[PDB]
Design a protein around this ligand. Sequence first.
Ligand SMILES: Cc1nc(Nc2ncc(C(=O)Nc3c(C)cccc3Cl)s2)cc(N2CCN(CCO)CC2)n1
Length: 270
Amino acid sequence: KEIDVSYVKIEEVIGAGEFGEVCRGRLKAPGKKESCVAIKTLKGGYTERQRREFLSEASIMGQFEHPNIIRLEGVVTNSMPVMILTEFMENGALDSFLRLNDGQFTVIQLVGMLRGIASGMRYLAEMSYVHRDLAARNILVNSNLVCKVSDFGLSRFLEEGKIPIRWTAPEAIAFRKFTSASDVWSYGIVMWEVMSFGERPYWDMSNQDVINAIEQDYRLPPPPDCPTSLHQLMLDCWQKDRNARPRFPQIVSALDKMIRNPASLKIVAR
Ligand SMILES: Cc1nc(Nc2ncc(C(=O)Nc3c(C)cccc3Cl)s2)cc(N2CCN(CCO)CC2)n1
């Protein structure tokens, strides 16, 4: 959906992306009220291949419509600079948002965030889309604490960017078989990131140390104050046999049960 350049106002540069700046702005189109948008720009000095990779994210995002998936507003391609516009997520990336707010949200709030992420993933799996880079740094958060999946692209990993080892299921590392079940492994890592308020998975371990540890049956321990039932769900996501892991509909169901029976979240390890 091509957007007339005159409908777009850039207000402030708010971050740095893979291909250039990330901005906050306003979109005002005839017959519609003004709305806030995030804007990524691609400025001159790039290869034609880079332009396609940049715009591919908009093509893929535009295939989806779900409250926990970032919404595309449109693109600017018949003019320079090239732009992609989405809904504006006032709290930015989830991992840094939680680090800024360490210990300041309740267990029930954290579970609600995890439920939104799992609902977005349930939708992607139903659409036969495998994310491959599910991580808290790729979840965006709005003013109401709603969490939405971002970072869309179908390009192969370098070995087939590099494979994100700490988030990746062991069969995907070893054999490059990426499936919704490998995204479930990654989702378990995201759960650990959320319940630890943005700690780095596996701390200072090297990538090869992580690979070897997982093969030797190590799994991340419960974060401080984490309900045991949430850590058990993490362990279920981290089963070595991909066919034994829960599927995303089952994950959403488990989180919904916790929200409805919050007394079950009181048990914590000693
Ligand atoms: C970098 C950043 N993004 C924010 N919100 C975003 N919403 C949507 C974004 C976005 O990337 N969409 C998008 C995607 C996903 C793909 C292609 C194209 C596009 Cl356009 S980025 C907020 C933010 N903050 C800075 C720090 N704090 C403020 C100061 O205290 C909190 C807020 N920082």
